[PDB]
Design a protein around this ligand. Sequence first.
Ligand code: CLA
Ligand code: CLA
Ligand code: CLA
Ligand code: SQD
Ligand code: LHG
Ligand code: LHG
Ligand code: LHG
Ligand code: HEM
Ligand code: LMT
Ligand code: LMT
Ligand code: HTG
Ligand code: HTG
Ligand code: OEY
Ligand code: CA
Ligand code: CA
Ligand code: CL
Ligand code: CL
Ligand code: CL
Ligand code: FE2
Lengths: 37, 334, 38, 101, 171, 34, 34, 137, 243, 97, 30, 151
Amino acid sequence: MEPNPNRQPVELNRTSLYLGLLLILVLALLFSSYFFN
Amino acid sequence: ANLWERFCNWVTSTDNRLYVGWFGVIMIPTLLAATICFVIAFIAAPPVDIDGIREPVSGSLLYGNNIITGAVVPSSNAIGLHFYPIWEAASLDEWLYNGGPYQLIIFHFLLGASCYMGRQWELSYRLGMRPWICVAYSAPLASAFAVFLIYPIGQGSFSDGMPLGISGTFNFMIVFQAEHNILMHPFHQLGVAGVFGGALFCAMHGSLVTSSLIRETTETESANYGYKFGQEEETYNIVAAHGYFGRLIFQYASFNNSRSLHFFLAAWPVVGVWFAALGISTMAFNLNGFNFNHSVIDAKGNVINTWADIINRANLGMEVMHERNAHNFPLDLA
Amino acid sequence: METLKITVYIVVTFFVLLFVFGFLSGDPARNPKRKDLE
Amino acid sequence: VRRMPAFFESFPVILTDKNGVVKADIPFRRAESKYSFEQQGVTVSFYGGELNGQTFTDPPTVKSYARKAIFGEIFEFDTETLNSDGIFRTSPRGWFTFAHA
Amino acid sequence: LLFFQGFHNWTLNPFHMMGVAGVLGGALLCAIHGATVENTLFQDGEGASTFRAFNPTQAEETYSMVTANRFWSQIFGIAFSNKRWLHFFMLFVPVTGLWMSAIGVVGLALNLRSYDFISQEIRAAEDPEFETFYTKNLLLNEGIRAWMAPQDQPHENFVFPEEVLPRGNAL
Amino acid sequence: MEVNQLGLIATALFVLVPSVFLIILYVQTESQQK
Amino acid sequence: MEVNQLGLIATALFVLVPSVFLIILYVQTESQQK
Amino acid sequence: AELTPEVLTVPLNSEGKTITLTEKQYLEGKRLFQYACASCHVGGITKTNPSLDLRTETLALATPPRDNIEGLVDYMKNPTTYDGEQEIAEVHPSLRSADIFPKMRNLTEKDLVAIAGHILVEPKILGDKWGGGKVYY
Amino acid sequence: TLTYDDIVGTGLANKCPTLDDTARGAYPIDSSQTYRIARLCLQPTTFLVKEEPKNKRQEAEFVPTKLVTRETTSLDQIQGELKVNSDGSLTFVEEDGIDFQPVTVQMAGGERIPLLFTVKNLVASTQPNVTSITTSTDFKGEFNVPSYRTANFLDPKGRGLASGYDSAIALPQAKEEELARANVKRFSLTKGQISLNVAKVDGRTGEIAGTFESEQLSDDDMGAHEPHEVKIQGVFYASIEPA
Amino acid sequence: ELVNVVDEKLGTAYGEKIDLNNTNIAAFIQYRGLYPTLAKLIVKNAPYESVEDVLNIPGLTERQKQILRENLEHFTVTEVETALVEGGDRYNNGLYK
Amino acid sequence: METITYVFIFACIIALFFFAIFFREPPRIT
Amino acid sequence: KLGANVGSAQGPTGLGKYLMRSPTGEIIFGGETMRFWDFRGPWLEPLRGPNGLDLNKIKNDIQPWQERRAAEYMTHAPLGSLNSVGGVATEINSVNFVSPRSWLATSHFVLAFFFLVGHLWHAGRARAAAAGFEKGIDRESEPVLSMPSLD
Ligand code: CLA
Ligand code: CLA
Ligand code: CLA
Ligand SMILES: CCCCCCCCCCCCCCCC(=O)OC[C@H](CO[C@@H]1O[C@H](CS(=O)(=O)O)[C@@H](O)[C@H](O)[C@H]1O)OC(=O)CCCCCCCCCCCCCCC
Ligand SMILES: CCCCCCCCCCCCCCCC(=O)OC[C@H](COP(=O)(O)OC[C@@H](O)CO)OC(=O)CCCCCCCCCCCCCCC
Ligand SMILES: CCCCCCCCCCCCCCCC(=O)OC[C@H](COP(=O)(O)OC[C@@H](O)CO)OC(=O)CCCCCCCCCCCCCCC
Ligand SMILES: CCCCCCCCCCCCCCCC(=O)OC[C@H](COP(=O)(O)OC[C@@H](O)CO)OC(=O)CCCCCCCCCCCCCCC
Ligand code: HEM
Ligand SMILES: CCCCCCCCCCCCO[C@@H]1O[C@H](CO)[C@@H](O[C@H]2O[C@H](CO)[C@@H](O)[C@H](O)[C@H]2O)[C@H](O)[C@H]1O
Ligand SMILES: CCCCCCCCCCCCO[C@@H]1O[C@H](CO)[C@@H](O[C@H]2O[C@H](CO)[C@@H](O)[C@H](O)[C@H]2O)[C@H](O)[C@H]1O
Ligand SMILES: CCCCCCCS[C@@H]1O[C@H](CO)[C@@H](O)[C@H](O)[C@H]1O
Ligand SMILES: CCCCCCCS[C@@H]1O[C@H](CO)[C@@H](O)[C@H](O)[C@H]1O
Ligand code: OEY
Ligand SMILES: [Ca+2]
Ligand SMILES: [Ca+2]
Ligand SMILES: [Cl-]
Ligand SMILES: [Cl-]
Ligand SMILES: [Cl-]
Ligand SMILES: [Fe+2]
């Protein structure tokens, strides 16, 4: 099949990885008490 | 080129991602029906009176089973070998209570797999290949026929057909051993020689060819990149492989001819499994394994047990316990 | 149930007919070599 | 009471005299039973522990304690605290041996 | 074999199951590979017996990997395309199977069995209408143990009076 | 304590799914041609 | 039924951790040049 | 152990007299039992009525007593119910019903004797196995 | 005048004989002659199960159910004494026959109700002064309902009453009190009531037919749970003849 | 409260002798002259308030009355147990060898 | 939740069949 | 004979111990043999009436020869070992018997199966021989190489 010209590479730099993991982990630390109830 | 012509060209086309073919025109719908009914029954079917004694057995996930205990349960002993399609029942509820799903699934499956075999022939012919792959497949297929159709015919009921589940398969095996002593039957023994042997030779061929791959790669890449799909040259040193194997045993137990070797690889498990299938299919008519119960007697007449007699004691355990509420008379004649 | 039965019969007869007339439609010639196989 | 060997997940209840002759049991089939606790008037008396000095004569209780007797010495258990299911589990001796083999 | 069924419920053990999959899968690979090579052979001689048309020192593959790949891709949906991977996999499956079965047996040395499903037992104990193939098989096992143990384990001096032997109706 | 029994799987997936999303994006970014 | 209460999280992590390991490896492979 | 004269010695009648069988007698008895009886009586039980067996104590409590040679020979000529009340030649193999049970047709007095001897000697050898059924296999 | 081969597989074997619309006469009863029922047949057409409400003070209704055990439900070849009592009434005393059928019906939502549909040991009498059996005649009486399973029956863990384990062996160290009701099998024996309403009489042949309604308890799984109340409605056939 | 009535009956004379009111008919093979004729008559005309009531079965021969008298000592009677007499179990109780 | 787990895993396996067949890396001849 | 009323004897499951109904109503033998109610034979057919087995004929009309024959057949069931030990697999040595029906059925199943295999063998081979590739694929004209890629 002919290649799609709309494709683009995706990026996540290391700082974004760290920020994202902080957000996820802290949101988890916050919400877990409520999930356990 | 009218519509029928184009249709035939498409059905028999060598360009479809999955070959359809005329065998496929039967295979596809029957296999779809069998699969769909199977998944639904395995998930949600209510319990089934397998032995026709109003003692329903639960097979589905929603009714208390896991993957290991679950089964689609064989149809009721009260039905026997009677044809029980949905439309013979007064309702779907009746149909389910009596194990109708089992009959629908195994009949569609047997038809479908038969056509699958046919289809292997068919595509081999469209591609200019030699024809006998399908003959290799006749061995597992014959086995399926043995446990789903022939044994029920021999014993007079689909309720004795192998259940469509893991633990159900074990149940089938144990009861089979109780009633036919299949371990002492030479056809089952040949079957074992076939699958043990198949496994052995599988590992053997695999490891020898692997062991004589010609060096085409470095240490930091997979040896497999050393072979390119469609390449004309053989990817390993069959002379080296042969040399190894001949020194391991002696020079002449080894196959230097790859065609004979590969034929042997096909023939050993296919024939072994053919005999396994024939084992089940003849024990279907109660020609059972060897019976050496009390075969050794001393000078007075005391029985001197052999391992055959211990096997007999285990078989007795199985016999007396199986289908504990189903027998009213002293002999289990089917 | 009567409707289900008739339906399944029609379906089955259909596919079986496809099979039989299909294999009757010059099938020996549908191979990549010799076709004059009659 | 005949003791349960390790091999057996379940074991019958059979009582013999000192010489090993069968004197009582719990029958599976009742119709031709000769050794039932009721027929043989089996009683159980306790010495030591919580039931010291006590004797039981009603067949259900005698049978219950016999059932326990196939496990060796008989103990009172708290099964509610951990919601215990009544099914034997191995010790760290077992688990260690397994992992390391 | 029968002992391991009756006492260990060995068929229920996922390690035995992996063993079975490796062995039967091995036999399957042996058969299917053999047949495939024998049915995608190049015509390399005039004989109707095709075995003579092979030479050990030949450089050429004796069968068509390309035709084999098309065939299995169209029949089964997927196919080998790498011969080296094919043969390594043929090593890998039965070898891995046997190794798993060995692990299970090591468990059985300690009676560390896959004997029961506790949920099944709790339900069945409370509910005399609940039946599955699993509980049916346990009844078979109980039969095996009772009827086979006196002669099979003579050193135990088992005496099981007739009345304690587990038996279904009539049999 | 009589906590909610789904709490554990809830917290575990809540952490793991998006974290894994990020790790996948990061690793495939690193491996792109420098 | 009275199933083991850790069966769910055990099964979930059994699937997810190695599946995710593989997805990471695969995607960073595709994103490499050539 | 061996098949001694003492093992081969069995009651001849209700009055206490014994007969001592030859090894040949015992073996022919086994063979005739297999030929004409084992289809129902294998191992000393009775497949078409398991309540009645071929144990010696059972035969002894039969009417008339069947726990001796003459009693058994008589049975094989004119079988009765356990209580002696009904002649059952019509549904049980005997010289009397050899027209409908043809495997009895060429049986001689000596043959009946030898069979009777097998039935009395066999439990002396096998013990509880004789008439014991599968429990004792 | 049908044969077995006319009948086999049709479903007709589970149906009771019928009488024409012409059979509306009267069968004379001679007080001096002795009588018997040579054949009583009962063909259930409907199985109703009384619901079990939650508030226990609401009127409970009998609801329709789906038969799931096929055409295996009818009682037949039942025979017995037909007594002529002091007051002119008749009394049928059941003596023998295929006088029971296990039946499983299914309730809306899936619940299955097994029952032992039966008229075992039926005794049933008419009104007084039945000089001739007519379409105004009826029979009311009672019968026995023994346990749906008999004593040898083993549950899926091998427990039973006259046989089987007496304990939950898969739970060797569980407490037994909470399992008593499942471990200790019990044999039910209760009563059922039935009315036979004569709709048709052939006075020449002494044949009668009509409708019945019977009430009885269902399976209780040998004391593991409470039975349900069941109401069975159908048709009956009977051949009266002087013994 | 919950009691297995069969086990319970094993602690009565039903576990010591032939109960004319409950025991399965095969038991009558234990003593000379009782099976099948008298066994049938006895099981058919049960239950009995006492063992000697067995002597009053209609149609008994004088010889049969004698034999019965010889065996009264091996007999007992207890209350009819539904679980032992339903299902035609006195004639066939599911036990063979 | 056990049933949901079993069925989930199964469903994923079928999905995988779909991708492994129709979205396989195409074999190419050199 | 012992006094049982076999029409009314409830078996342990709730079905009749001796007699029950087929799924379409006919009166048939109970126990496992419920599967075999389609059986017909000259020794049993006199006991049969319009609705199946007839309770009255059973009570009154069973002849000695019928009992004989039923007993003979019950004890010559087609079950037996390969070394001709008669009966079920757990039976002890004593009877030398395997039914002719077992010998004939098994032998001809094996023969029929292998002949199905022979059919596939010679059918496929005849197709490939008539088409010209039974000896293999021609290297210089390999059909798959002139077909478009599947993907
Ligand atoms: C390939 C298509 C196909 C085939 C071959 C079958 C086959 C079957 N179906 Mg299935 N089914 C299918 C698709 C198919 N099905 C589809 C798409 C659906 C969804 C609607 C179903 C839904 C379904 C249900 C709900 C049931 C079945 C059942 C059955 C079984 C009974 C069929 C029957 O009684 O017809 C009989 C047909 C006739 C009497 C007329 C046939 C006319 C032709 C000309 C006769 C030729 C036949 C002869 C042998 C020659 C063969 C050719 C040979 C030379 C190669 C049979 C196994 C039943 C079952 O499983 O019972 C257990 C059942 O209950 N099917
Ligand atoms: C579908 C059917 C099936 C299949 C395919 C299997 C497969 C297997 N079973 Mg299982 N089994 C089954 C059903 C099945 N089983 C059932 C229903 C039960 C009842 C519960 C069992 C009970 C059972 C037990 C008790 C055991 C197995 C074991 C095995 C494994 C044995 C592998 C082997 O080759 O050992 C063969 C032996 C070897 C490979 C050792 C080396 C042998 C040397 C090299 C031989 C040298 C020979 C030498 C030249 C001498 C020859 C002389 C000549 C005269 C003979 C294999 C995975 C075994 C296992 O799990 O082991 C870990 C095992 O112990 N099974
Ligand atoms: C239809 C074929 C057939 C059948 C059903 C029978 C049946 C019987 N024969 Mg007869 N017989 C046959 C053919 C047959 N025979 C042949 C071909 C011969 C010449 C050898 C004989 C000569 C013969 C004699 C001398 C005697 C019998 C006897 C018997 C009886 C006992 C059988 C026995 O114990 O075997 C034992 C079981 C075996 C030997 C099993 C053999 C397993 C085979 C080899 C498997 C083969 C499968 C397949 C063909 C292999 C294909 C290979 C594959 C790679 C393609 C039985 C009634 C006996 C009897 O009782 O007579 C009164 C007896 O004394 N037969
Ligand atoms: C509750 C019950 C509900 C069930 C409902 C199920 C009905 C589904 C009908 C949906 C119709 C569309 C689906 C097509 C998808 C597809 O496969 O196309 C894939 C290709 C592409 O089509 C090719 O496509 C080409 C172009 S195009 O892409 O179509 O435009 C075209 O030129 C060419 O002819 C064509 O072959 O089609 C083919 O290769 C030929 C047909 C293959 C048929 C496969 C059936 C498999 C049966 C398996 C049975 C066992 C199942 C269990 C196994 C887990
Ligand atoms: C049911 C189906 C479930 C599907 C699961 C889907 C999961 C997806 C989860 C996405 C998470 C996104 C994380 C992106 C994280 C991230 O990439 O940030 C950095 C990013 C920088 O973007 P740039 O434009 O610089 O792009 C650089 C690229 O490398 C990014 O791809 O900014 C944003 O993404 C915008 C949102 C910022 C939000 C950041 C907040 C961080 C603050 C810390 C808070 C915690 C501490 C508080 C203490 C009080
Ligand atoms: C003839 C006996 C039938 C059973 C064995 C048949 C061997 C082939 C069956 C396996 C098929 C596998 C899938 C097809 C695999 C495949 O495609 O094979 C192909 C292979 C080679 O084919 P060719 O075309 O070169 O030769 C076959 C014909 O074309 C004739 O030249 O076939 C053979 O070698 C046939 C040889 C049979 C000669 C007789 C064999 C005797 C075997 C004896 C076994 C007895 C064992 C008893 C128990 C111990
Ligand atoms: C009518 C159509 C019938 C087809 C039905 C569906 C077929 C499904 C076939 C498997 C698809 C998934 C393949 C994944 C894996 C995959 O994509 O294979 C791809 C792989 C391609 O091999 P190549 O030689 O091209 O790969 C070489 C190099 O790429 C390796 O580095 O094929 C194999 O390795 C064959 C051996 C595995 C064969 C495994 C078969 C498994 C059967 C099912 C087992 C699970 C059953 C669970 C039941 C709940
Ligand atoms: C073979 C010739 C043969 C002999 C010998 C034999 C003996 C026998 C005896 C001694 C009895 C009485 C047992 C006792 O008193 O305890 C007896 C009873 C029965 N048998 Fe028999 N028998 C021989 C052959 C056969 C055969 C072939 C059958 C099967 C058809 C058969 C069956 C029976 C039956 C039934 C009884 C019990 C009869 C009754 O009391 O009603 N026998 N046998
Ligand atoms: C038991 C029933 C007995 C009934 C009597 C027997 C009569 C049998 C008659 C069979 C008729 C077969 O008729 C057959 O039809 C198909 C479809 O058009 C033809 O097929 C032909 O046309 C199609 C469509 O253009 C082409 O794709 C094909 O290549 C070509 O061969 C066959 O060449 C023809 O021979
Ligand atoms: C259970 C929860 C799990 C969550 C899973 C989430 C899945 C996320 C999938 C992300 C897909 C990544 O998509 C991937 O992008 C890279 C670039 O970024 C592409 O890579 C492409 O670009 C790069 C850079 O120009 C080139 O070097 C490369 O040769 C080219 O193919 C891959 O071809 C594509 O596969
Ligand atoms: C009639 C019942 C008599 C009571 C005696 C029972 C045996 S002892 C009993 O065993 C239980 C395990 O089964 C323990 O949980 C419990 O602590 C203990 O009291
Ligand atoms: C795609 C849906 C197919 C699955 C349908 C399952 C059967 S339907 C199911 O049946 C149960 C028992 O009768 C009822 O309890 C339940 O309420 C009902 O939903
Ligand atoms: O083995 Mn045993 O034998 Ca063939 O039937 Mn008789 O009991 Mn039952 O129906 Mn499944 O199972
Ligand atoms: Ca608890
Ligand atoms: Ca009226
Ligand atoms: Cl079972
Ligand atoms: Cl039976
Ligand atoms: Cl005894
Ligand atoms: Fe190879």
